[PDB]
Amino acid sequence: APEDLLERLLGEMELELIELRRALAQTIATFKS
Amino acid sequence: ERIETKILELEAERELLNPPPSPLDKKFEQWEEQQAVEATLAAMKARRS
Amino acid sequence: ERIETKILELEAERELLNPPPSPLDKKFEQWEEQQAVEATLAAMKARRS
Amino acid sequence: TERQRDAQQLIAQRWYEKAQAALDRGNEQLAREALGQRQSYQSHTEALGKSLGEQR
Amino acid sequence: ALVEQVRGQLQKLERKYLELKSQKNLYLARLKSAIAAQKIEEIAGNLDNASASSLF
């Protein structure tokens, strides 16, 4: 069902809005160091 | 040493989670409060001089 | 060294996937915003001077 | 969508009021930045406004 | 002379090590960031409304 992908694909994107959230934290952490 | 930088990351990660104020907002919350104190006090320094 | 260029390709491949703005569009989004700020502010600098 | 539009204009109204605080008393320059800041919020209001009419 | 010169090598080399370790953090951080930014723009491309076999 094509309608079901719309939910799962958006589910995958919730992983990086947090993962990329970690990447900025590391970069700022290195700057403070 | 690793303790100190571990603390650095906790505080920094919180900052992106809750951004600090922009300088633009900083300029007014002092600039407006000056009259928010003076304007009220300008009324007071006129009302109650 | 290979890390650095590996990063170069990731960013560049994204650019063709999502093209950056053309200079023609760049010219107006500043050129129009000047009056989008001045024209509104020209109304304001006339409305509220 | 209606609720989101109302919130956006309230922020613009607050920034509008904040510029209505700035431009008085001779400081049009800080109004320029505030209005310059306000323009980013004005754009969002227009896009949602027409969608609400279309969705009706 | 031998003991002093060899110590200079260690002092010079030790400084160069921690400098390298600092850069490793930055390059890895940029890499993990760069890989992440790609796939949002790719998953968006799947759902981008571009008439390119977009699901929408």
Numbering used by the authors:
A (entry chain G): 24 to 56
B (entry chain C), C (entry chain Q): 169 to 217
D (entry chain B): 57 to 112
E (entry chain L): 113 to 168
From the manuscript:
The bacterial member PspA is part of the phage shock protein (psp) response that maintains structural integrity of membranes under stress conditions such as temperature and infection. The main effector of the Psp system is PspA, a 25 kDa protein consisting of six α-helices connected by short loops and an elongated hairpin, where the N-terminal helix α0 of the protein remains unfolded in the absence of membranes. Interestingly, PspA is related to eukaryotic and archaeal endosomal sorting complexes required for transport (ESCRT)-III proteins and has a similar structure. Here, we show that rods of bacterial ESCRT-III protein PspA internalize and thin membrane tubules by overcoming the required bending energy through progressive membrane binding of the N-terminal helix in the PspA assembly.
Due to the critical role of helix α0 in membrane interaction, we also prepared and refolded an N-terminally truncated PspA including helices α1-5 in the presence of EPL liposomes. For the truncated PspA α1-5 sample, the total diameter distribution was narrower and ranged from 235 to 290 Å, with two maxima at 255 Å and 275 Å that were closer but not identical to the apo distribution of WT PspA. In the PspA α1-5 + EPL sample, we determined a total of five cryo-EM structures with resolutions ranging from 3.8 to 5.4 Å supported by visible side-chain details. For the α1-5 PspA variant, we found only five rod diameters (235, 250, 270, 280, and 290 Å), whereas two different symmetries (C1 and C2) could be identified for the diameter of 270 Å. None of these structures contained any additional lipid density in the rod lumen. Although the PspA mutant lacking helix α0 shows no structural alterations in the helical rod structure, it can no longer tubulate EPL membranes. In support of this analysis, when we abolished the α0–membrane interaction by removing helix α0 lacking this binding energy contribution, we did not observe any membrane internalization in the lumen of the PspA (α1-α5) rods in the cryo-EM images. Interestingly, when the protein was reconstituted in the presence of membranes, the ATPase activity was increased by ~210%, while the activity of PspA α1-5 was not affected in the presence of membranes.
